[PDB]
Design a protein around this nucleic acid. Structure first.
Length: 61
DNA sequence: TTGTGTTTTATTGGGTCC
DNA sequence: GGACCCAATAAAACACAA
């Protein structure tokens, strides 16, 4: 039960930018986002997974 | 400024790939 | 084959009606 740490503005900007380019992260873009954000590749994957739940939820209104 | 519904991280679990 | 996906869920933090 180790507790969540919200992502900074600069971190979210990199994630959002890449998401807008492709909803599904690739291995190489995951590596590069990790370098650019200091988030682990796992965190990034989880973020994309999470981000598609959000889009799904917001279309549905 | 505050209460609390909403949103954001993070885990767990089932399915495909197979 | 762990690596992907997505759904249900919890807890921390946020957003914004009062």
């Amino acid at each position: 039960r180790k507790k969540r740490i919200p992502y900074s503005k600069g971190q979210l900007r990199e994630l959002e930018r890449e998401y807008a380019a492709n909803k599904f992260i690739t291995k190489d873009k995951r590596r590069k986002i990790s370098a650019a954000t200091s988030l682990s590749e796992r965190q990034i994957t989880i973020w994309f997974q999470n981000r598609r739940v959000k889009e799904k939820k917001v279309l549905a209104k």
